[PDB]
Structures are given as structure tokens and as C-alpha cells.
Design a protein around this nucleic acid. Sequence first.
RNA 1: GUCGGGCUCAUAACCCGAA
RNA 2: UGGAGGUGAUUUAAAUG
RNA 3: AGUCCCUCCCGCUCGGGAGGGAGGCACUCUGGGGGGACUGCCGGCGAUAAGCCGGAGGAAGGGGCGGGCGACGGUAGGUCAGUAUGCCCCGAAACCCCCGGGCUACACGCGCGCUACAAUGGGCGGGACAAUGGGUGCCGACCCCGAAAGGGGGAGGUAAUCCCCUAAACCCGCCCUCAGUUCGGAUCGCGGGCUGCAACUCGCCCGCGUGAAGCUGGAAUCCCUAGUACCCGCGCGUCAUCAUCGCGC
Lengths: 64, 65, 149, 135, 214
Amino acid sequence: GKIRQGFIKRVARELFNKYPNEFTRDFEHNKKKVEELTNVTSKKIRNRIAGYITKLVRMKEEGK
Amino acid sequence: DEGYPAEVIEIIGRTGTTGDVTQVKVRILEGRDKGRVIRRNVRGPVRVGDILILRETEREAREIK
Amino acid sequence: ATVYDVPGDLLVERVAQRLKEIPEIKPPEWAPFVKTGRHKERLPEQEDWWYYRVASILRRVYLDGPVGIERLRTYYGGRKNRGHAPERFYKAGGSIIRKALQQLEAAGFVEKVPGKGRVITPKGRSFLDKIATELKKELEEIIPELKKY
Amino acid sequence: MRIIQTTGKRKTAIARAVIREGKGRVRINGKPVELVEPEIARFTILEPLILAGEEIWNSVDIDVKVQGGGFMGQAEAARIAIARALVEWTGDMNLKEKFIKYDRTMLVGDPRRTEPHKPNRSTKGPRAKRQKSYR
Amino acid sequence: AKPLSERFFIPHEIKVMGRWSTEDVEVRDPSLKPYINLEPRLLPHTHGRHAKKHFGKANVHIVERLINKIMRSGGSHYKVAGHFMRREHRSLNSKKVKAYEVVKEAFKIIEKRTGKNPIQVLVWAIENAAPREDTTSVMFGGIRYHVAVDISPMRRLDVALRNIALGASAKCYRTKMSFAEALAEEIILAANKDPKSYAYSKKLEIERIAESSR
RNA sequence: GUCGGGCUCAUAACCCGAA
RNA sequence: UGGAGGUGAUUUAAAUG
RNA sequence: AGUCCCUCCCGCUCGGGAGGGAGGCACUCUGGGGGGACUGCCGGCGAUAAGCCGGAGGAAGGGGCGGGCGACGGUAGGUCAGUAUGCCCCGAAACCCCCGGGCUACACGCGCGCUACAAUGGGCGGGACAAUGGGUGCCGACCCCGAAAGGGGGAGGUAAUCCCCUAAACCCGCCCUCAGUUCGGAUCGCGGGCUGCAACUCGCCCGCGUGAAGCUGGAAUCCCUAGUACCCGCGCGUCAUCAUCGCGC
Ligand SMILES: [Mg+2]
Ligand SMILES: [Mg+2]
Ligand SMILES: [Mg+2]
Ligand SMILES: [Mg+2]
Ligand SMILES: [Mg+2]
Ligand SMILES: [Mg+2]
Ligand SMILES: [Mg+2]
Ligand SMILES: [Mg+2]
Ligand SMILES: [Mg+2]
Ligand SMILES: [Mg+2]
Ligand SMILES: [Mg+2]
Ligand SMILES: [Mg+2]
Ligand SMILES: [Mg+2]
Ligand SMILES: [Mg+2]
Ligand SMILES: [Mg+2]
Ligand SMILES: [Mg+2]
Ligand SMILES: [Mg+2]
């Protein structure tokens, strides 16, 4: 089961609110943004966070 | 003497003592009741679009939960 | 045409037949009575097995020289049935190989590189490659794909 | 004078092939491909050449050096190297599309390797175990 | 013995083993047609890449399926014609080259004996050996009973191939007949509905038991 | 009935082989 | 949400410490 | 690999091969750093959540695959015969050394395996292709001697340099043709070696001879889902010598 982890969601929600006009629906752009805006050291964790932020952007833009 | 072919159109569920049987809905392709839809019990892997050769077309399997 | 262009077993057969004309190749006096190694069970069934072994050794020197006794002993070893115990690999003996190499040197086909082993002479290379050319000529009558090579 | 090099791998066997304009001669470790034995190994190497056709086959020469693995691993690695060399040399997409349909592994390879062995009858394999008794 | 033209055989077309085409081969049974793969192919050796995926075996050429079926011992944990046949160190487990040669020699014998394309005869045999009705087991009062059911086409194909292989295995066990001759004999007998064939008799017995348990 | 082996955590019942 | 009643049924054998 | 020179072979050289040297880091490989996969994209089910099912593209697709790491406790589970330690005992013996025996006995019940009961083979000659590891109290190429096991000299190696190291199953040709046999190789006689201070009790190897049961296995019962199971050999541990074992390839 691919159940998202708790701390990933917490940090992605924190990142999304602080910079609403910084994340788009592009995975590569969000990957670079997560790389620049935190001290995350694992490549796997960075990808997980970026993917969840992408989903958040398209969920709020769609209006839920 | 040569059976009647029937086409599987829907999968219902697994049954049997050890789960080895699948119940399906089939449509008769040839013979007296050509066009009739009946449900049957099958041994072995099966998917939508398969064809069975029934040796008789008057027995229908009991509906399962 | 060279040794590389023909099947090995057919070439060994032809070379063994041609080796019976060289007066320096003669089976030792104990040849009728011995096995070719501790992993065999019965004696050789061909009355002219010495010439086959000599031809095989010459082709081996051609392809892998310089080479010495111990490595050839590895090459001619094999699997052994050990009764109720599991089968195992064993090396061959040395007398047959050493005598064959000495006879081949007596015929001028091989020579000794000091501390390194034995190598094929230009005479031995010509001897092998001529027979290989003859076999390849016969061979491409029935396999036309071998004319391009 | 074109020279093109390609590489192929299959379970610890490694093959390096070189291709240039020629007359149709294909050698494996110095031996003509027409004399490779057994037959099952020979047909493994020859499939891409037969797929390409007689025109392309007779217009090139191919030399292959292969080491490691076994007699079936070495045949498949050489097959991969030859197919890659043929697609790169002639540079046409009908032939490449023909390879993917017949056998995708010809161009994408095979990543499988042996699984390391584990205790409880380690010498036999990772999963096979000793017979169990209760009395 | 074997001529040098056959020892070094070079094919130039894509056909089964470089010797037989399957262009005129027809499959009469409508249920087995999508599962008997006949697409043109020279070497029937796919290196076991089909078993991972569900329904993957459908797109495997029928000759390779046969070769895989005979690469076995035969009688390990059930008896065939009244005997276990445990061959162990002299079995064909994992020896695909020997099984390939067995199938090739059997095909040559079949073609010589009947005058027809061997693939067609094999197709006829598997059609005659594939059962249409089987049974499943129930337990009541400490007594085991049968209940009749239908069979899916993939299982029909698998069972027919298995029984052809087992019949060939039994015909050569501790007798002067060879494995290739036994396989050719079993295929030919099954193609003609002779009760001397193991697979066809097995097929008749299964259908009779299923019929008498409706 | 005797002896031996299965099944059970074990014994009885039960199954198999033998003289 | 939680309760009180009624009518039907229950697929072999299975002792002991 | 392409390029230059030298030497030797072939169908006598238009062409095709093999060594050596100059030269190069292309290719393979070695090992530091980095990229790549996120249910990210598409269509359904579910609630419009959590997720699930099916497609593309892709070396790789849904913990990508194989491993290490085992919570609070229990099990009076095993170990004081690895080492540590309380109490009780021996303390001129229950402590310390030396010699010879024993742990290797043999009407019999049981576990786990090896070799077979043959043609999905046995024998004889010929032809192919590995990886893991290890080496100075050592690995030993190469030459000579011997039918074999073995013996006498001995280059290089403190090791990507030298050595163990030219695996077997597989392929070609000939003999045997369903038989207790050219199946099987237990058991025993005579002779030859190695290690060691010592080979009877009680070691391993080789030559000739000898030739037991076994012709597929009752009731029961074990392992395994992919480079997995089956089949085949090999390395290391133990080790002076000795592998039907363990751990790995
Ligand atoms: Mg050999
Ligand atoms: Mg044997
Ligand atoms: Mg064995
Ligand atoms: Mg393994
Ligand atoms: Mg009892
Ligand atoms: Mg994991
Ligand atoms: Mg206790
Ligand atoms: Mg206990
Ligand atoms: Mg003991
Ligand atoms: Mg014997
Ligand atoms: Mg042999
Ligand atoms: Mg005998
Ligand atoms: Mg004695
Ligand atoms: Mg003794
Ligand atoms: Mg007897
Ligand atoms: Mg017999
Ligand atoms: Mg032990």
C-alpha cells in the first residue's frame, strides 16, 4: 500500500501555505522548489514532498 | 454431439470449497436458445471475451452472494 | 584458410590420419596397457589412439601456446564416478603428454621457450594450415556459406 | 571508413561488436557464425541478420568478442550487440520497429541476475530448505 | 551418420525451426483459437519471460509450450499407468537443448509417417485431447462427492498438453522405444481418436465422470 | 492373538506391513 | 442510538491427562 | 578498436590470419561524484477524502528487486562445558603433567542425506563456455622421471602484476539394445604411495582381481511463486593429513 507518510504531509502543507505563488502543476519545477526551500537531504523524500505539493496545487486550483 | 459455444460477458465471483470456481454470465451463440443469457460455474482462469463449449444448455447455477 | 575456419574434431581426425606418415611418431611400448588418467574406468577402444592424442596435443599447442605439462593435464582431466561418493573433477597423468611433446619436437613441429613452455614452429603452422585448407575446400562444396570466408 | 562499436550483456557475459562495410562475414571469437554449435545457439545469433534481410546482411562485416558467462549467455549477448549495431549503422526506423515487435529484449536487454543464497541449505539456493521432521 | 548438411544447417526465412511453415494450419475449435499461438517465429525459446504476468502464456508459440512440457521427470508424486517414474539425475529437468532435439526428431518422424505438416497433426491431437467438462469436490458426513462444472479454454489447453507429455513419458519408460518415437506415436494416436492414446482415454474418462455427476 | 511402523503434545480408538 | 418477545431451522464420528 | 613498423603461415596473394614492438584510454573494467520513479501523466471505482483497478512512456511502476536492523514483555525455554559471578563442595585430591586405552563397541528402533535400481542411459576417442574466494608456517608456473598415486629441481608472487585456474551438466562419431546386462559398485585378497613423533585399535590416495541388495517404493509425509524450483560442477571454513557437512559462487 502506497499510504503517504505523516511528516511528509505536514512539511508539504507548511511549504504550500507560506509561498502560495511558488508551486505549480509541474513536477520538475516543484522538485527544484522543494530542493531550494528546505534542508531535505534524501532524494526519495524530496520527490515524495514535491508530488504531494503538486496534488495540493491541482486540488485547490480545481476548487476541490 | 459437438456442444454449443457461449461467450462470457460478466464476472460474478469466486466460489467452491477452496476458491477454485468462478461464476459467470454467458450468452449462447448457437442452437435452440441462441440469444439466452444464463449463469454458469467454471473451473480455471477466465476473462471477459472467452468462449466455453457447453455440452447442454438447460442447467443454470444457483446465484451466489 | 587457417585452423580457425574449420570444425575442431574433423581437423583432429584428418591430422591424425596424416600423422601416421611421420617416422618420428611411434607409440611407447607401454601404450597397449594403460588408461588415460585416474578418472577413466576402461582402456581405450581404438587400436590407434596414440595418433589421435598426438594430433589433439599439436592443435592445442597451435591455439594456446606457449603451454606446459600441468595446464595440459588440466585440459585432459575430467569427472570421476566414485562409487557411493559424489562425482568429482580430477587431472590427467603426465607421461603421455610429455612423451607426445618430446616426439613432436623430434619431428620439428614444436619448440621450447625457456621457462614458458612449448610453441608451434613455422613448419608446424604450415603443416596444420595446409590440411585445414584442404578440409575447408571439401567443406564448402556442401556449405556454400563458407566461400565468403 | 566507418567503424561502429556496440555492447551487449546477459548474466555476467559481455560482448563487444564492431561493424564496417564488407561482404557478409560474421565471426564470433574468430570463428565463422555458420559453424557455431549447438544449433540452438546458432539460431540465437542469426535471428537479427535474417530479420534485416539479404541485401543488408551481405553489405557489411561484423566481428564480435565475447567473454564470461556460458554458451547460452554468450549467444544472447552477441545477439543484442549485433541488433544494436544494425539499427545504428543503417539508421532506418522500419527495421527498428521490426525488432521491437519480434523481440523487445533485442534492443532493451535483460536485467535479471542470480539471487544470493541464504542459510538453511545455503548451497542449494536462496529459498530451497532442508526436509522437516517432527518425530 | 547424420549428414554434414544437417549438422550445419543455415536457414534464410522466418519459420518454425527453419523447416516448417504454419500458414495453412487451421484451428477448428472456436474456444481454443485465441490461445494457440501460431505467429511466425524461427527459434521457440523465450527464456521464461512469460510466467510473471497474468495470462502471459497466451502469447507463447505452441511448439515452445510443448518443449517446456516435456522438460521434466514425469511421475514424481503421482502414478502414471500404475507407477511412479522418478528419474532424478537422468531426467530432462532444465535441459532445454535435449528437449528441443526430441521435439525436432518427433516432428520429422510424424511428417514421414503421415505425409502432412506436423504442426497440423499436433493441433488435431490437442483438439481431441481437450476436455469440455470436469468436476469439483465437496465433503459431507465424512464422504467426498463430485459436482460437475465447465472448464475455461486456457485450462483445457494446459491439461491437453500435460496429458500428451505424460503419455509419451510412459511409452518410453524401461522399454526399447525411444522418447522421440513415443512422442510421435502418442500425437498420431490422439489425432485419430485411438483409445491406445493416453490423453484421449483420459479425456473420455474425465467427461464420463463429469456426466454421471450432474 | 504376536511383533514392527504410521497418526497425536501423549495414551486409547483408528490406518498399514509382516510372521 | 438502544432494548423486549415469537416461529423456524443447526450435514458422520472425536474418550482421557 | 582504429593507425605505423617487424616476423611467420594460407587457396601464392588481388585477399585472409597469428605473434612482437611503438602508440592510444576509444570499448570492457575498476571506484569516487551525480541523474533517474513521484501514483507525476491519462481513463474508471470509491465520497468530491483515504485509497483501489486498468493504460501510455520507460532500463526500471506502484516497500522497483534481495538483504541488515526484532517494541513493553513472557517462555523458571537453552547456556555457569566460551568468558564473568554468589553459595556449596575437593583441597595431597575432584588441582597440575606423562604413557597406554576409550568417545570409532553392535541381535535392534528412528532423523537427515549420498549412490542406484538403467536408453529422459553405460563405455571409448574428439570439441565447447564461468563466477565467488584464497596464497610467505604459503600458492607454486616451467623442465625432468614414473603406468598411476606420486618423486627430484624450481621462475614469479607480501599480489588488478605471479599462482591456485583450459569446471561439469552440454555437443560430434563408434560399441552395447531392455538384460540383474558393457546396469549397480557394496564387500573382500594381493601389491604401490603421502602426512605425521606415531597409521593395529583408528587416516587418505592409486593398479589388478572380486562382484551383495536393488527391476520405481504400503499407510503416511516435506520444499518451493522467477533467473525461483529442478539438474550441474566450483570456492572458502574446519585443516599437518582427512568433506557424502556448514556458508557462499
Ligand atoms: Mg573432455
Ligand atoms: Mg553414475
Ligand atoms: Mg551426483
Ligand atoms: Mg542459485
Ligand atoms: Mg496409540
Ligand atoms: Mg525492501
Ligand atoms: Mg529450565
Ligand atoms: Mg525441553
Ligand atoms: Mg561421538
Ligand atoms: Mg558399471
Ligand atoms: Mg568423454
Ligand atoms: Mg554384473
Ligand atoms: Mg595390505
Ligand atoms: Mg589403520
Ligand atoms: Mg535380487
Ligand atoms: Mg530393468
Ligand atoms: Mg559438522
